[PDB]
Amino acid sequence: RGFYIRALFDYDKTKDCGFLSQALSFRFGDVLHVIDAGDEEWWQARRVHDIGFIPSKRRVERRESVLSYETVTQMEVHYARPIIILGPTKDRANDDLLSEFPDKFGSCVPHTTRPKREYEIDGRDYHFVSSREKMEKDIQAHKFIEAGQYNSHLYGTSVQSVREVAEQGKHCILDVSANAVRRLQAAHLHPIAIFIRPRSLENVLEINKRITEEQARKAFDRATKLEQEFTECFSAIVEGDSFEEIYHKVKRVIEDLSGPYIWVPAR
């Protein structure tokens, strides 16, 4: 006694040992405080949001490199947590959050070493960097949470760009990959990473009634592959039979995890 834990999977009472136990059901992202982990096979804990008992880490590894739990610690933040929405209809959710709540959501501009085209303007389209070599060194100095190459030019989203929005009290809506989650954590700027999970190929067409089936299958395959690799990085997983419900859940998740005190992974 005793540490704090975070569920990386959905667990139901009845599927394991019926409701006829003192067991505790929990969903992905639930933070549990363990009281007794002495039992080799099963663990005593309580929900931090409601007192009972939860299965162990080595135990669930036996049933199904499997994902069980991650140890977490409470931390106080003084900035607004950045946002990383992933999965189907993420672009619509990103654009909708910014238009609907302009006082609490903002966006940042990526850097590039590509010569600024005449119609483009610096600071809005891109932060245009005249010296390529300078950006490559900033990349090596861990100044970028994401960086790539296109037509022999560097593109990237800097940690400073994100932090500037965050320190003005606004959630930075980020168009980045899941790999940016770890780098933001390492920069002590922990994002709310939300994964929109399609229940099936048919569900994709339900939450996105615009795209074709051919596009839906590709989006579904990308979503399944995304969940395979970055599930640990997800702050939450949301589902729905419509985009409006998904959007509804995204708003709730953001509100719940935007508190002064948050839970972050431990050693």
């Binding site: 910014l98 966006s107 590039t112 891109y126 970028f144 960086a147 790539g148």
Partner: peptide, 16 residues
């Protein structure tokens, strides 16, 4: 409105 496809092709293409 926050999306730059040049940036996207840079990232989802080959990245650092």
């Amino acid at each position: 409105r926050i999306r730059r496809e040049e940036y996207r092709r840079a990232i989802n293409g080959q990245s650092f």
